[PDB]
Symmetry: D3
Subunit: 175 residues, 6 copies
């Protein structure tokens, strides 16, 4: 029951990300349906691009855009869809699309799971190649879709990311 997974052990620095799409996956956009807790296909992108890292959501959050908060999680190996990963937020990729807000958080595995990300404390600590690859992916994977687009704005720090988690958690908690 994905629907009974906690938002985190100690929000907002210690969170749980439920994986929707694994790293290196084909360009099929999936989305969690909170009514059923089932993953629905959104769209089969026409571009020849693959997901640069894992993509999931924080359960029990309500982003202003209506969906839970989405998170990009880089890992040693691709994660199983539906698995829950303990992470630590490090930044946010600010973007917009024809529909409005589309920011995505970036988080790294918690030290209990792996020791290789212990030194990534903020968005500026992530490899420059990884950040460029992620931003490029989002800017272009919808290129061949008519009436759809994505404008990538920039990166924001961990503090920005944490503000968003606590705000979205409360936005569903008290509502």
């Amino acid at each position: 029951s994905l629907l009974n997974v906690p938002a985190g052990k100690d929000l907002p620095e210690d969170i749980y990300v439920v994986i929707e799409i694994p790293a290196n996956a084909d360009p099929i956009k999936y989305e969690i349906d909170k009514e059923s807790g089932a993953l629905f296909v959104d769209r089969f992108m026409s571009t020849a691009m693959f997901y640069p890292c894992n993509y999931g959501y924080i359960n029990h959050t309500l982003s202003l855009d209506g969906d839970p908060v989405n998170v990009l999680v880089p890992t040693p190996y691709p994660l199983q869809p539906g698995s829950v990963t303990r992470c630590r937020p490090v930044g946010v990729l600010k973007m917009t699309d024809e529909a409005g807000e589309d920011a995505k958080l970036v988080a790294v595995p918690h030290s209990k799971l792996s020791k290789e990300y212990d030194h990534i404390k903020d968005v500026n600590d992530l490899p420059e190649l990884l950040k460029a690859q992620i931003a490029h992916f989002f800017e272009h994977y919808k290129d061949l879709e008519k009436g759809k687009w994505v404008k990538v704005e920039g990166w924001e720090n961990a503090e920005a990311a944490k503000a968003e988690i606590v705000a979205s958690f409360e936005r569903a908690k008290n509502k």
Copy 2:
């Protein structure tokens, strides 16, 4: 909760297919257990064949054969097991086995998901190679199983497929 996924947005022309087996999967027959909503292994086929396309079921349907209605869904890339795909029915592959009825519906992704199947309105619009590959797969994947077989009868149109969806939906709705 696969069990809370609707049968469709607008039956029978607009349905939801819950994927059980992805396209190109190894010859392991899986089946949904409606008691638990969990996928159980049915049999490991001994033939060297792979699934020609995705295989799923329409939730909230009761085929006369006892199970939900099964659907074959061809896609640009293989779908994740347990994901829900919005489709449009285009035909049916009539078959029987030692146990009785074994017809399988064929449906294509809804236009909202992809624009490449918009021109496939009926079973006769599907590529002739695809239809031959699907029929051949079902006729032969159980070849090396003792006391089991499949006799493929032929293809029926979208109207036949739609009659089956509404009949099976009601057969579980009012029962």
Copy 3:
């Protein structure tokens, strides 16, 4: 709902194993969270090893170590995570770690699913190469993890395995 899957059709000789990790998977240790029925990432191992066979648990069991009873299931092809496989227990791999008991049961697909394991009645019937590969995997996959280790003790017969299933089933049934 993995949580509603029966422990077995006829315990302890006829059981159901819910798959957590498929055969040949990368070294990411997953674990079932019985609160949510969701799979959580435990650890990303640093070794260059892969799972020699499928790894799952028997639902409705309570091993003394706190978790459900874990089972290793060898199959013709890798199983889908979350799928339920009907098996017959044939032995147990006795092991310990820094945390205590860590025995893992070994079971083969039930004859209804496949006929290739019908002649494996006990732990001594399994291929000698398979047993060595499994024991070696467990002895070494945690090698590069600080403060963690596994000491593989030896193999025990089907009778030992069956005693453990009935004991663990009752340990959760009457508690």
Copy 4:
């Protein structure tokens, strides 16, 4: 070896394409070394894109960019690197990169290999999606490479492609 392979059975209508990169390969750009007849790694691209179809060359040809003529070949399943495919040229994607000419022809498997492309006689017969995908891939796969770029001029017909095969074949012979 791969240097004893003809440019074709009957240039320019009947050609042989030696595969260098399989369809769906990761973004590692390879280049044939004319002297060794060995495949050299040229560059690891930083974008998250995969090769939209098989990429190869016509042996015994020398295009303006100094390498043999390169050909993109669509197939049902990805081809093995180094295998030779009998094809029919159907068009060319005109482009220039930071170094000069960079045209890629497009050829389909010969009818003896598969009837599936028998109808593709010219550039306008190819699927619009595939053409969009190929152009988009070449337009952007080098986006994150400093100093590297690709200007896409557009598609040209079978006749333009056949003229390049003839000119390039003679350019390698009359040398």
Copy 5:
């Protein structure tokens, strides 16, 4: 290159098999070009079947079908195309196709490579499943190919296989 490889260390008991197609490969039939020593795509099969084991040839041999002797080789993991495996012939699958003779020998890896097949001394020692799978694959992989067919006469012993290796080896030498 691959043309400087011996037919074997000690024909016909000790042979070398150059791999053309890996175990589990898609249904693309390849054929070695004797003059180039290059692998040519021969046909894309339309059936949904995969190669049951590694498929190769004995260099410096010429069977009746005009190609070198072909050998099927079972292994723990699929082999790389072009690699040379030291084997022991254990049998032959007698067949004829639309063109004439079409026998395939079966060889197991030599004891220096793996002890796992040391007990397989003859055709009757091979697993019944594997033999069933191989025959079924050759009986049906060309089912959807117009004008193409395969008549399977049956299995023959190691002696029959060794006689073909000797005759084919001499047929290429005394030419």
Copy 6:
């Protein structure tokens, strides 16, 4: 062919590595046959381990173990067997096996191929995890092979690696 490839552009700082085994490959140990220039299967390991990175050799070299110098090369994506990668040697893993010398150098892709390793100038610059993973893999992949063993003496610097490239290059020339 692969025998017409230079040992390097400027030994020992600028070398070419011909790939034999891709990163993440199954435990099948291959060995280059100097006379054929063909890859021979040497042994199927029984341990459940995968190659931690690409494994190759420097053409026109002859190390003490009788084979050309072997090199481990880390890359963003696994390389194709037989492709040639321009590298920079950065260290050597000193080891001995049951037969004698068994050192493996470590080289990183040249800056023309990727900027990603430009900072790796010496052995101590490589990630500690990767080095741990490589040593652990060589220490244990032959554990289940009777009579086979590997003693790992430790890492050595770029200078030690360059001295071996020079000595091995001359040992093959002055022969």
